[PDB]
Amino acid sequence: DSKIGVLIGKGLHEFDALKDPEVNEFRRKMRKFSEAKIQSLVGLSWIDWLKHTYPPEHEPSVLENLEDKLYGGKLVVAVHFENSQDVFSFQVSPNLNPIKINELAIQKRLTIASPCDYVLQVSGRVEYVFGDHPLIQFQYIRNCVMNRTLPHFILVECCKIKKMYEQEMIAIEAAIIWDNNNPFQITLVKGNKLNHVRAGLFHGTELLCKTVVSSEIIWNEQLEFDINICDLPRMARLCFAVYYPVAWVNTMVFDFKGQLRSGDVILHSWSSFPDELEEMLNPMGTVQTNPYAENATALHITFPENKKQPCYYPPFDKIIEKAAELASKKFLAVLKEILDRDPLSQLCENEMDLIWTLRQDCRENFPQSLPKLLLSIKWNKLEDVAQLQALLQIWPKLPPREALELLDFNYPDQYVREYAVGCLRQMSDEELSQYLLQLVQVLKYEPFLDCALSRFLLERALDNRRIGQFLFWHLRSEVHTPAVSVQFGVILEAYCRGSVGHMKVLSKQVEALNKLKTLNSLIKLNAVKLSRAKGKEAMHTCLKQSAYREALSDLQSPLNPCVILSELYVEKCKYMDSKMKPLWLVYSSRAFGEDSVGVIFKNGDDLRQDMLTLQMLRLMDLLWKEAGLDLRMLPYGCLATGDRSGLIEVVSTSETIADIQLNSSNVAATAAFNKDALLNWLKEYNSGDDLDRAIEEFTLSCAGYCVASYVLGIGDRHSDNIMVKKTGQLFHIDFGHILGNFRVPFILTYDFIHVIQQGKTGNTEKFGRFRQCCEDAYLILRRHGNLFITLFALMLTAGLPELTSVKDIQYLKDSLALGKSEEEALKQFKQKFDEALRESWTTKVNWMAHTVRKD
Ligand SMILES: C[C@H]1Cc2ccccc2N1C(=O)Cc1nc(N2CCOCC2)cc(=O)[nH]1
Structure with a gap:
């Protein structure tokens, strides 16, 4: 009770103080779901705990170009023991089980123990690779081959896993009209x-x-x-x-x-x-x-x-009873148009009567008609409602993407919303995490606590820790907001009770962010007294303290639940000299490599806009991949942890256009005066075949972000908000405003064109492929136009200043040119592309001028 209160950010006594029957009944009902989850965990024993908490991801499919990608038809893995710093580099066949790595590593240690009492753990992640499955089937190995990266494993003894399992189990066992x-x-x-x-x-x-x-x-x-x-x-x-x-x-x-x-x-x-x-x-x-x-x-x-007697709304049996009492030239082309309309479109009285009269044709021929069919009645007559409710159960389940529309402002009815969530039960946890941001904001619109949405969100969060950790922070960020303090608090309490074992992981995160909030506040006060050189030393001394070191080290990242944040690399830690003073944290790598795990802490700045934009970038990259187009997108993690406070994932080995133009240390930049800095920067870290892959990764990423910034309306673009990774990938950062609420034209610079054309002006073939790539990406985004509208419609209750009414979503319809046909929509895109090309040197000037007016 006391442990839950501090963790959720609201006292359990505050809910009892309200003396509301709705609050008391919800807490009582959710406790039954929480306790049933505890009882199911004690039944499972030994290896079964990992098979439920962290299961190994595997696919039985075959990989393309397997012979060339492998080191002579074999995998090369780096493995070290829990206390040993000595890594063992050896070759293992892809067709063999993971137990072969266990026996080949212990033999190497014996030369300079049984392999059965050991389990393989992914480097710096709470992920495990085990089972009677071949090594090539496992996802971590599969991703390593595709990304070329070498797989790193840590041999954890079965007794240590047993010690980790038992310690959690003790805490789980401690839970005992008409x-x-x-x-x-x-x-x-x-x-x-x-x-x-x-x-x-x-x-x-x-x-x-x-x-x-x-x-x-x-x-x-x-x-x-x-x-x-x-x-x-x-x-x-x-x-x-x-x-x-x-x-x-x-x-x-x-x-x-x-x-x-x-x-x-x-x-x-x-x-x-x-x-x-x-x-x-x-x-x-x-x-x-x-x-x-x-x-x-x-x-x-x-x-x-x-x-005399308080009258209730008729029950489910009574609604269908009235519908049966009522029952006992067709214009298909005009109905087909109404059915194909976007969710923002409104219906006329004459249009509504057509869908209602053709309700039997809608049920038998078009299952996608239901969103328009539910709005065909004014709901001001009991006869119209009862007949519509009867058609709802016999209606087949709509796809989860189309089901999300039935959860917005237009559909307030309980039975309609109960159907929508039921359709969302069909999708996997991986699919649910993509639309999880929208579903949390629907709870704000929800009039009553006990609803089908809140029950389903809790059911999935308890069964999956990745969904659980994300839902926790989505609700905790708005738990201090008085408008949703009661609603978000009871859902947070229900999750913590059903996941006592995960509370220790979440407690370390809350404690780490509190130290970050304190460190951010200390620098804000010391800004007027201390200098930049002295202020950096003050931050290093503060992080070196035992209270700050123990709280920020050895814990799971709130952005990525798998990734483990080890010891802080104090020397590389920095802060921005701006008004809000954001923190930059660099974590020390392990014995294998590696790319240092970075995390940005921002306090005083709203990151809700950044969360939504990166979620859309993730969706754009997902929809492009479904069409068979991988544009090598980098939609980095962003999570709001509290009120105007959150965390940002750092993309390793990446610099801004401004930093590339202002040559770091001493690099061969004399071209001269660091002319065409972007191509020269990529040539320094990539040579031969790797340079060709870097140009290819740049042209695909540039094409994706150019379309994304045009569609979403990401304005105020300059040298400081566009970053380039050392692998070639281009990505956008710092998303302040959305949907042109900073209207926003297509933006293209010569610096990008010089990279795509590989320095040669007469290399039109390479730029032609890039132009067609932008055109191809824009047309795929047009097909899923209704989905993008649906997602923004559910975010109206979030409280964003740029997105308040239905008029704010109108920009997305104009940018995608949904009102125009496929022919005229591409012609509109081409016109903006040609305008961006003719102003490419003007864009180059404006961005270089922005780099000049610095420090
Ligand atoms: C200006 C840079 C340098 C710096 C130093 C200390 C603290 C913060 C920052 N900065 C930033 O906060 C910029 C910035 N960087 C962002 N990045 C996310 C992707 O990996 C690279 C970093 C995302 C974002 O929204 N803003």
Whole structure:
């Protein structure tokens, strides 16, 4: 209880202090799911623990060009023991089991023990390679061959794994209505903290009945709506606005149990108003009241309590019963158009009647019609709702990508949302992690705590630690926000109770980030007193302290749950001399190599925009690979850990265009005055065949990021926000604003063109391939246009300044040219590409001028 409180960032006593039945019932119900997960873990013993927690990834497929990629048809592996620094480099056949590495390494140690009492652990990662499967089948070995990198293994004794297993097990063991013809009416009585009130009923975006306006001024007025209690839907929204805007508040007609509310209800209104409003009201806003204890604007309203027995919404059996009581020239081309429309598009009364009349044709011929079919009714009639609900169970499961649309603002109904999550159960954990950022923000829109989405997100987080660690930080970053403090807190409590063993891993992360927050605050104060040379020494002395060293070393990274952050390389650790003073942390490598694991800590700066942009870059790279196009994208890890605080993954051996132009140390740059610095920089670290691979990796990565920055609208591009890795790969950094909210044209510079053409101006064939590559990448992105719109629609409740209303997503439709045909959309892209080429030297000047006005 006390251990959970400190970890989640909210006291468990705070939930009991609220005295709310919804909060108490959710905590009770989720405890049953948490305790059942504990009981399933104690049943499993020995090797079965690793087979569930960290299973070895394997594929039975065959690899292309296997003979040339292998060292004489054999794998070369580097292996060392837990306490021994001596690495053993030897050849192992790919067809043999991982036990062959175990026996060949112990024999080398015996010359200068049984192989069965040893397990293979991936270098600097909580990943394991074991089983009666060939070595070529394993994913870590497979990736090593493709990326050319040599596989590094650490032999961990079975007794040490047993010691790790038993210690966790001790902590796990320690857990021991429709008949009512009367119209709907509410009484407006008093506005407490006021410095007329408009009322209206909504069901997503749709207006259920005509809006009601109160007399201009204490009110004591009966506001009667043009709808009956029988016709009211389950997830009906009652919106209020005081105005000229003063205060707005939203409330639910039916509670979490499904009962029609009766009696006096106090509603704490909000001060901030959005730019876009529907009928002078905000139906897009949350139904949660202002948590400010007697300080914010309060609106007192009285629900009809004159009823003898409290009436609930009809149960599932009663809904289908009414649907059966109702039941017992076709225009296909015009229906096909409506069905093919994007999620942002609105439907007309005449269009809605067409889908409703052709509901049987929609059910039998087009399963993709359901999102449009659910919006074909106004939900202001019980007959229309019951018939639609009956068609919902007999409807086949939609693909997970199309299912995500049924979770936005347009679909508030419980049964509709229960179907959507059911379709998302079909996808794997790897697929779920891609859309995990969007699903967490849907919980903010969710009116009640106990929903199908919260139950499913917890079920997957408990079964998989990679999903679990990510969900933990997604909720903990907004746990201090009063608007979602109660909602995000109970989900965090439910996960920690069901994963007592993972709490130790999460505790080390919370403790490490707290020291980072302290170190960031110390430099902010010492900035006006100490110099740059003295300030760097002050940071090194602070990190060398026993309190800082023990807290930041030997723990799993919050960005990547596998990667282990070892001892900190104090000498390479630095900080930026900017207002927010971000920290740069470099971790020491192990006995094998290796590329030093880097992590950037940023405090005071919002990283929610960076998280969304890199998630889109990951999705773009995934959709391109499905078409058979690997553009060698580098969408690095970014995770918001707290309020205006987060972490950034460092891409090893990479420098900005500005750093490449301002030659580091003493390199042969005289070309002269470091002319065409990008090509000369790549020539220094890549020679012969490797240089050709570096040019190829540059032209593919440049093409991908040029299309990505044009589509997403990533503006303010210069020499400091574009980085180049030593392997050739080009990538964008520091994503401040999105969707042209910094409109944004296609950007291309001569520095890139010089690399693609390999220095020769008459090498048009290479640039022609790059131009067609940009054109190809843009057309693949157009096919999945509806998916990109869906993902941005679910992020409207996140609280981003650039993304507030549906009008902000309109930029994405224009950039992808979804309104134009495939022919005119490419012609629009080509026009912008040719404009970027004609302004390539102008872009080169503006970026070089930016490099000049520094220090
Ligand atoms: C200006 C650089 C140098 C520096 C020194 C100390 C602390 C922070 C930073 N900097 C940054 O914070 C820039 C910066 N770098 C980023 N990178 C992520 C990919 O690997 C390379 C680094 C991502 C990002 O959003 N911003």
